[PDB]
Antibody
Framework: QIQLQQSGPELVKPGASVKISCKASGYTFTDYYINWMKQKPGQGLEWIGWIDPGSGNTKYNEKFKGKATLTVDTSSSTAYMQLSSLTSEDTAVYFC?????????????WGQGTSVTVSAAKTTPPSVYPLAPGSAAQTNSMVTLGCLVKGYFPEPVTVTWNSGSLSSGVHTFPAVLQSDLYTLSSSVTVPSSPRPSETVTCNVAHPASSTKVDKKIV | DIVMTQAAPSVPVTPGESLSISCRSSKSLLHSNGDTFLYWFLQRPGQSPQLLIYRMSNLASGVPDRFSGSGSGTAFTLRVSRVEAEDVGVYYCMQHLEYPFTFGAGTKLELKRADAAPTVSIFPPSSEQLTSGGASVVCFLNNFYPKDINVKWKIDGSERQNGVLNSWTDQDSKDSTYSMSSTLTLTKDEYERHNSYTCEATHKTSTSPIVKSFNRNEC
């Protein structure tokens, strides 16, 4: 039951700062180092710095020093990392890994990472548009429909097909950034028998704007 | 900085087969202590990386008997005996010798299987989207393998190269297929001027390109 739980989704704008967390459990927090890794959307993985929780002695990456400030909290078993003077080059996932310094030198466990998003300060509710074919023969059994969610910020979006009933055939695509907004689309393969005489309404949810939009496919 | 390099970004293998992932360092991770400071991790994929092998030839705890690290100097090699579904992911080789610590690019493990044809589909702009002044034509190419495919958007026989946004899903856990969603966007001013919009797809499972189309004045 040894685990590390990080803070979660971060709400930041350029120039500001943010404090990432990483609580450790199931073991003595002070007799194990704590590294901090950064990961761009798909560029790779890199070391930022570690911190001895027995004595706040820290060691940073010369390339992240002067922006990263690791500070522990022996009040219980927590760890933090501050990122100051944020630029869009900081929008990424940050992991916090334990370490068996002495014998193995092996980074045992890891946190779930924290997605830090630093944008041009936008925030917009999506526009959901129903996707239905232009024709369809009865012989053409499996009918495919869709839901186009365009013009939103920030991630993520909760896309469902009926209310959670339609599980199989659901293909919810990865949102690709437009100019200053996100856009995704999902589709479902339904038999040619149900659709014509049965409703299909995708449930779109945007927590960031707190809006729920149901759109029937016709 | 010590440059960590991993030759191939991706390497496909069928379940049961043996995989060999290579890693290459910039200097030499030897010590004299007799140990080579090399580390292998496994991001998988929306999950967190897990230590597989430490100090080059040491199977971490919990790690199965089938994984194996080997090499010397600058040539390092991870090896999976029997490839199982769980093993899918990006494998990372990282050094823990000099400062700062560097991580290799990342070699992904993809699953092989029989070739399947893309169930392409094309959808006209929604009535609601049009009233907003914009027009988007969506083309879905469902389940297919291999991953390679090419979508050429045609508007009245002319190839549209500016205004298209692709989106490929990750490899499905169940059927081991790949999905994609090609979306073209216009101004509902340029959309009304045209008749036909074609979504062409060049895949291995077709002697000729899969063509899906629709014409405006067509009910």
């Amino acid at each position: 039951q040894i685990q590390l739980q990080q803070s979660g989704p971060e709400l930041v704008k350029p120039g500001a700062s943010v404090k990432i967390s990483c609580k450790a459990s199931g073991y003595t927090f002070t007799d194990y180092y704590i590294n901090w890794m950064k990961q761009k959307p798909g560029q790779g993985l890199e070391w930022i710095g570690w911190i001895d929780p027995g004595s706040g002695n820290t060691k940073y990456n010369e390339k992240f020093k002067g922006k990263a400030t690791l500070t522990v909290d022996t009040s219980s078993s927590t760890a933090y990392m501050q990122l100051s003077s944020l630029t869009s080059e900081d929008t990424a996932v940050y992991f916090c890994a334990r370490e068996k310094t002495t014998y193995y030198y092996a980074m045992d466990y890891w946190g779930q990472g924290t997605s830090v998003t630093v944008s041009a300060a936008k925030t917009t509710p999506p526009s959901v548009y129903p996707l239905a074919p232009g024709s369809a023969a009865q012989t053409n059994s499996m009918v495919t429909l869709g839901c186009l969610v365009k013009g939103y910020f920030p991630e993520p979006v909760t896309v469902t097909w009926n209310s959670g009933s339609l599980s199989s055939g659901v293909h919810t695509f990865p949102a690709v950034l437009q100019s200053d907004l996100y856009t995704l689309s999902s589709s479902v393969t339904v038999p040619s028998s149900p659709r014509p005489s049965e409703t299909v309404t995708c449930n779109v949810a945007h927590p960031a704007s707190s809006t729920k939009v149901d759109k029937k496919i016709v | 900085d010590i440059v960590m390099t991993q030759a191939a970004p991706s390497v496909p293998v069928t379940p049961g087969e043996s995989l060999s992932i290579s890693c290459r360092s910039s200097k030499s991770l030897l010590h004299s202590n007799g140990d080579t400071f090399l580390y292998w991790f496994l991001q998988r994929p929306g999950q967190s990386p897990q230590l597989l092998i430490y100090r080059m030839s040491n199977l971490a705890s919990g790690v199965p008997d089938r994984f194996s690290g080997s090499g010397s100097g600058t040539a390092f090699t991870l090896r999976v005996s029997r490839v199982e579904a769980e093993d899918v992911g990006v494998y990372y080789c990282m050094q823990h010798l000099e400062y700062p610590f560097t991580f290799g690019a990342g070699t992904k493990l993809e699953l092989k299987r029989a070739d399947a044809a893309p169930t392409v589909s094309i959808f006209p702009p929604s009535s609601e989207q049009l009233t907003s002044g914009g027009a988007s034509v969506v083309c879905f190419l469902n389940n297919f393998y291999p991953k390679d495919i090419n979508v050429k958007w045609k508007i009245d026989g002319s190839e549209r190269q500016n205004g298209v946004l692709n989106s490929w899903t990750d490899q499905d856990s169940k059927d081991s297929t790949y999905s994609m969603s090609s979306t073209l966007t216009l101004t509902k001013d340029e959309y009304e001027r045209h008749n036909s919009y074609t979504c062409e797809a060049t895949h291995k499972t077709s002697t000729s390109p899969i063509v899906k189309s629709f014409n405006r004045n067509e009910c």
